Paper text:
Human NAD-IDH is a key enzyme in the TCA cycle, which catalyzes the oxidative decarboxylation of ICT into α-KG. Our previous biochemical studies demonstrated that the αγ heterodimer alone exhibits a high enzymatic activity and kinetic properties comparable with those of the holoenzyme and can be activated by CIT and ADP but inhibited by NADH; on the other hand, the αβ heterodimer alone exhibits a low activity and cannot be activated by the activators but can be inhibited by NADH.
Crystals of the αβ heterodimer with the α subunit bound with an NAD at the active site (αNADβ) grew at condition II with the protein solution incubated with ICT and NAD (both 50 mm) before crystallization and belong to space group P21, and the structure was determined at 3.02 Å resolution with each asymmetric unit containing four αNADβ molecules, which form two dimers of heterodimers via the clasp domains. A number of strictly conserved residues from the large domain of the α subunit, including Lys-69A, Leu-72A, Thr-74A, and Asn-84A of the β3A-α3A loop and Glu-260A, Gly-264A, Thr-265A, Ala-266A, Asp-268A, and Asn-276A of the β12A-α8A loop, are involved in the binding of NAD via hydrogen-bonding interactions. In particular, the ribose 2′-OH of the adenosine moiety, which distinguishes NAD from NADP, is recognized by the side chain of Asp-268A via a hydrogen-bonding interaction, confirming the notion that Asp-268A of human NAD-IDH (or the equivalents of other NAD-IDHs) is the specificity determinant for NAD against NADP. Compared with the αCaβ structure, the NAD binding induces the conformational changes of the β3A-α3A loop and the β12A-α8A loop, yielding a closed active site.
Residue numbers in the entry:
A (entry chain A): 3 to 337
B (entry chain B): 14 to 354
The structure:
């Protein structure tokens, strides 16, 4: 049949690249009905920020999601709608794969890396308050049960996708109790899976080793104590924010696929944004849904365009409009 | 004529310090080192030995140090003697020099970068406690008093060293009250420095930018959001932990160290370490002591020995030994004395 999926066009360069991936999916006869829904910060009755009700009933019905980036005030205002979205649907695994693009040459060759980050605790414990004048205190909490659920996710991912190694990336030398628990739970799941090789590294070691040689790494698992800056380091390895895709995975096959990048305000509206990121997340969603043939087709179209280099885009090689780039992929998918 | 506190630390620290002084000996450097052997791993640690070090600093006001190792069984790093030192010395600004070495080829050549981060709060303020059967809570603090001090230090450093622009790296999009306070404290002290450019950037973007196109930045000031992670990322751009030098400052004290200090920084055996980071910081130290001739001489001797490519250690892709490499820098540093013009 024809399955539907909730689309959130988002803010900034969101609506452009959303339109860009819808066209490539239209051009591919992809059996997918978009349900365009808007998510802005509506403030609930008790002051607690809530999603738009139209958006939540949409996600509950479809349990699949492709969203663009959302603006979050870079000073004060509403809390990030992405943290809110991830927690209200309990998408506890954030999966970010960095693989090099064969057509696009970069100082780093043949990187293949999956960053599995826990997606609901840590700095997503939104409690942060003022103690006295000019003194701010933040309270983050990690639970045992979440540490175990992400380590199990990580090891299952390593098995479902035929990855040989898993590395727990921790700061247990400095955050004894928190990361000591995460390592404690990572180690238990590792004993039940001798087929996957396990090791632990300190995050500061990993960052240094990564920019020197990513070929040492396979899947990396992390608590949400240090943000998503390891996969931002990884994003630069393969070509920046225009190409790195994302997935927020939950249980019972619920997921919201987005990209690592943000609203891109400096380029917003100028029809110069790169839609490879959101496109590659949408082929993540496709392979999640089992539409494997539409996936390989759309993905081959995208890479073969990047490889031709004729109609690239400003974040990559040369100047061509997002519209121009989306069209040369549409031309590729149909043939 | 010039006393300096030396703290060899654990690991290869004693080898690096032996490199600094056999070079300093070969260059007739007028510096007398006061060594304190403070090692918790070897059972030479106590708070009386900590105090003997502050006494040495109260007189010398300048120290070159290794890494005091901490035993991960029964101690996290916050209670390590390496933290008690920085608190007793009130070191608050960490300064890392990410500068390419001509002849040590990496993927980011011709790079000239400095990272300033705050060293007394954020992560190093962490208080952890257990709220439930299996729930851990970490408490962190940010303050205006300590953000103003580090942003002022950054612009002072920027003018004093002729640097052009200062980027403030923050995560005030999700840590609104905490890091917006630091961001504000930065924009306030930027108005007092009109000859210095100033911009901000969300921390997610900066890491991507450091590995994609690091040449944009010049001076990075940031809070202790995530510890030494960025210093270690950036130090990978330019050769890694055996080359990147670092200094930590107080209101009165200057402590010169290495810049990349992950727990396995040069976890090598008895003659395999690279003295470049330590030797460069020693020369940076001499500059601070206003011995600008000796400071410049050492630094040129080391920069030139690795441009020729003859003697190279393992990390630099070579089979030479730490003694081989220092004996070559002493060979070149004594030539540079006898033929100075
Ligand atoms: N929805 C999300 O997942 C998400 C993630 C990060 C940031 N944001 C939000 O957006 C803002 C972040 O903006 P920022 O400037 O710090 O980072 P950004 O990711 O929006 O962009 C930073 C840099 O990369 C460029 N860039 C980003 N995406 C690009 C693309 N698809 N194609 C070509 N160039 C691209 C931008 O032009 C800019 O130079 C904040 O409000 C923040 O809360 C949202």
């Amino acid at each position: 049949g024809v399955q539907t999926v909730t689309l959130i066009p988002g803010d900034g360069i969101g609506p452009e690249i959303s339109a860009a991936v819808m066209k490539i999916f239209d051009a591919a006869k992809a059996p997918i009905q978009w349900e365009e829904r808007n998510v802005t910060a509506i403030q609930g009755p008790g002051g607690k920020w809530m999603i738009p009700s139209e958006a939540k009933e949409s996600m509950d019905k479809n349990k699949m999601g492709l969203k663009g980036p959302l603006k979050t005030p870079i000073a004060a205002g509403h809390p990030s709608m992405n943290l809110l979205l991830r927690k209200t649907f309990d998408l506890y695994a954030n999966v970010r794969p960095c693989v090099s693009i064969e057509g696009y040459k970069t100082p780093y060759t043949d990187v293949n890396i999956v960053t599995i980050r826990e997606n609901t605790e840590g700095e997503y414990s939104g409690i942060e308050h003022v103690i006295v004048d000019g003194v701010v205190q933040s309270i983050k909490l990690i639970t045992e049960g979440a540490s175990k659920r992400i380590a199990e996710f990580a090891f299952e991912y390593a098995r479902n996708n035929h990855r040989s190694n898993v590395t727990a990336v921790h700061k247990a030398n400095i955050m004894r109790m928190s990361d000591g628990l995460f390592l404690q739970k990572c180690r238990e799941v590792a004993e039940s899976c001798k087929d996957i090789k396990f090791n632990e590294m300190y995050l500061d070691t990993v960052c240094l080793n990564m920019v020197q040689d990513p070929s040492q790494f396979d899947v990396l698992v992390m608590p949400n104590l240090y943000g998503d800056i390891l996969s931002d380091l990884c994003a630069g390895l393969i070509g920046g924010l225009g190409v790195t895709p994302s997935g927020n995975i939950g249980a019972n096959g619920v997921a919201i696929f987005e990209s690592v990048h943000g609203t891109a305000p400096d380029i917003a509206g100028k029809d110069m944004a790169n839609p490879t990121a959101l496109l590659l997340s949408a082929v993540m969603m496709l392979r999640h849904m089992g539409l494997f043939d539409h996936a390989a087709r759309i993905e081959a179209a995208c890479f073969a365009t990047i490889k031709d280099g004729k109609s690239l885009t400003k974040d990559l090689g040369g100047n061509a409009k997002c519209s121009d780039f989306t069209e040369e992929i549409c031309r590729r998918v149909k043939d | 004529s010039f006393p300096v506190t030396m703290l060899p630390g654990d690991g290869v620290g004693p080898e690096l310090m032996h490199a600094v002084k056999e070079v300093f000996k070969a260059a007739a450097v007028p510096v007398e080192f006061q060594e304190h052997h403070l090692s918790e791993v070897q059972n030479m640690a106590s708070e009386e030995k900590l105090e003997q070090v502050l006494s040495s600093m109260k007189e010398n006001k300048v120290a070159i140090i290794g890494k005091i190792h901490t035993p991960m069984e029964y101690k996290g790093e916050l209670a390590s003697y390496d933290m008690r030192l920085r608190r007793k010395l009130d070191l608050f600004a960490n300064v890392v020099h990410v500068k390419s070495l001509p002849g040590y080829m990496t993927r980011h050549n011709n790079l000239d970068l400095v990272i300033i981060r705050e060293q007394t709060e954020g992560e190093y303020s962490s208080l952890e406690h257990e709220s439930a059967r299996g729930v851990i809570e970490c408490l962190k603090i940010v303050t205006r008093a300590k953000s103003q001090r580090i942003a002022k230090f950054a612009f002072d450093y920027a003018t004093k060293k002729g640097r052009g622009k200062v980027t403030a790296v923050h995560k005030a999009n999700i840590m609104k009250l905490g890091d917006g306070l630091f961001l504000q404290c930065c924009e306030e002290v930027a108005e007092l420095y009109p000859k210095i450019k100033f911009e901000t950037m969300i921390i997610d973007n900066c890491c991507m930018q450091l590995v994609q196109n690091p040449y944009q930045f010049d001076v990075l000031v940031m809070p202790n959001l995530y510890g030494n992670i960025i210093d270690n990322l950036a130090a990978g751009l330019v050769g890694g932990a055996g080359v990147v030098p670092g200094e930590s400052y107080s209101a009165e004290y200057a402590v010169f160290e290495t810049g990349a200090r992950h727990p396995f920084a040069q976890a090598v055996g008895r003659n395999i370490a690279n003295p470049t980071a330590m030797l460069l910081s020693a020369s940076n130290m001499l500059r601070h002591l206003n011995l600008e001739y000796h400071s410049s001489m050492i630094a040129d001797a080391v920069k030139k020995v690795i441009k020729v490519g003859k003697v190279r250690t393992s990390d630099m892709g070579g089979y030479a030994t730490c003694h081989d490499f220092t004996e070559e820098i002493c060979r070149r540093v004594k030539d540079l004395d006898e033929n100075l013009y």
